[PDB]
Structure formats: structure tokens, C-alpha cells
RNA sequence: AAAAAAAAAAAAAAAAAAAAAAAAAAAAAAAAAAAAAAAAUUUUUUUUUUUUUUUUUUUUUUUUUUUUUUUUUUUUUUUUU
């Protein structure tokens, strides 16, 4: 099964077909990376409500439900790199007010609309790379008060304009 | 028909590390070899120059014996004109 080993559920390559929810729920770090994940269940995380950070990356996940943000209010690191994520919106990030780290290395998010990060105030580093971005614009209002890293690499931005860079 | 994410295999090529070895070249250390130049203990041989002993040839010198001719100093008994 998973490693556990003092609150670091580093679940390595074990061909886990479904997301497990075992007895050791009193942990803070859980690693779903390198595990067969069809999608993240919005209701299966009730058992593990003490996950300070989670590592669910490289997995094949279609879309993210808003419930995941409210089932785990104490969420700091959201590493979701190398996923499908055909389309995303602000609704899935409504309850993620304590988010501080995000990783998205391959998601093919060509178009971004509205303000997906209106509720993210403590989000420090941003990793939006290799997602086929055509413009660097993220919104029209002023948001992301405390941002230190904005990674936009391997994308297809053609030019930079003052209108699309005024959101910070 | 096309494009991508977890999850398991296999094939060509390039650059690497470790281990078991095997050859070629180069360094010493030992056991020997063939020699052209070397030194040192013993017994012998040839040749040159010199020492000692013995036996003999030639020449020279001293002494003694004997023999033959000359200068001869004398004589006794006689002869002698
Ligand atoms: C949630 O748990 C149920 C019951 O164990 C299971 O049937 C379902 O597949 C799980 N879903 C996810 C997303 O883990």
C-alpha cells in the first residue's frame, strides 16, 4: 500500500486502479502522483480532511470539481502537472482561499477566461507552462496580491501588450 | 483520420561506470648463458744480465833438479923451443 511513514503518504508505482482511503487518515502529506487515477472524486476526500498538502500530479484527470476546494480548506500545495484539463474556470477555485503553491506543467489550456484566481490571495508561485497559451492575460481586474513566481514556458504567446499585462 | 496524460513491456544507435579476463609495449627484482677487456694464489718452461763451487786448455811469474855451448878466473904433475 502507500508509504505513510510519519505523515508522508508517498504512494509509489503500485498500479492502484482507484483512489484509496485507508485507516491512517491522520496525515498531512499525501502523494497521488504516479498512480492510476481516472478522476479526483469530490466526495472521497472526506475521510482525509487533514491533508495540509497533496501531490496528485502527472495523472489523467478530466476536470476538477469545486468541492475539492471546500473538502480540504487547509490546502497549501496543489501540484497537478501533466493532466488533461481540457477546460477550467473560476468556479473550481472558489473555496481555495488558502492555496499557496500550484503546478501545471502540461494541461493544454489554450484559452483562459474571467478571473480563475479571484479567491487565491496566498498563492505564491504560478506554474502555467506548456499548456498552449496564446496570450499572457489572466483577467481584467486586480488580483494576486502576493505572487512571486509566474512560470509561462513552452507556450505559444505571440506578443506582450500593456492591456494583457495590467492585471498585476 | 489526427493530437495528447498516468501504467507495463521490446528493438537500432551514441556517450559512460564497475567486474572477470586475454594480448602488445614499457619498468624494475631474481635464476641462468656467450663472450671482448680485468685482477690474484700455486706449480713449471724459455731468454737476458750477473753470484758461488768443482775440473781442465792457453799465456805469464817464482823456486829447485839436470844438460849443451861461449866470457872465462885459477891451478898440481909434466912437455917445450
Ligand atoms: C470513492 O469510493 C467509492 C467506495 O469506496 C468507490 O466506489 C469510488 O470509485 C471512489 N471514487 C474515487 C474517485 O476515488
Author numbering: 28 to 195
Task: Quote from the publication.
Toll-like receptor 3 (TLR3) is a member of the TLR family, which plays an important role in the innate immune system and is responsible for recognizing viral double-stranded RNA (dsRNA). TLR3 primarily localizes to endolysosome and is activated by double-stranded RNAs (dsRNAs) released from viruses or necrotic cells during viral infection or inflammation. The structure of TLR3 complexed with dsRNA reveals that the two protomers of TLR3 sandwich the dsRNA, interacting with the ribose phosphate backbone of dsRNA with no apparent sequence specificity. TLR3 dimers laterally form a higher multimeric complex along dsRNA, providing the basis for cooperative binding and efficient signal transduction.
Therefore, we performed cryo-EM analysis of TLR3 complexed with 90 bp dsRNA, which was designed to accommodate two dimer units of TLR3. Subsequently, we collected cryo-EM images using stage tilts (0°, 30°, and 40°) and reconstructed a cryo-EM map of TLR3 complexed with 90 bp dsRNA at a resolution of 3.2 Å. Although the stage tilts partially improved the particle orientations, the map was not of high quality due to the lack of information from missing directions; however, it was sufficient for locating the four TLR3 molecules and most regions of the 90 bp dsRNA (81 bp). The cryo-EM structure showed that the dimeric TLR3 units were aligned laterally to dsRNA (dimers A and B). The two dimers were related by a translational shift of approximately 90 Å, corresponding to three turns of the dsRNA without any rotation around it. In total, the width of the tetramer was approximately 240 Å, covering approximately 80 bp of the dsRNA. The protomers from the dimeric unit on the same side of dsRNA are proximal to each other in a head-to-tail arrangement (TLR3A and TLR3B, and TLR3A* and TLR3B*, wherein the partner TLR3 is denoted with asterisks). The residues in C-terminal region are negatively charged (E524, D525, and E528 [LRR19]), and those in the N-terminal region are positively charged (K138, K140, K145, and K148 [LRR4], and K164 [LRR5]). Since electrostatic forces reach far in distance, we hypothesized that the electrostatic interactions between two TLR3 dimeric units facilitate higher-order oligomer formation of TLR3 along dsRNA laterally, possibly resulting in efficient signal transduction. Thus, its tetramer structure along 90 bp dsRNA is a representative model for the lateral multimerization of TLR3 along longer dsRNAs.
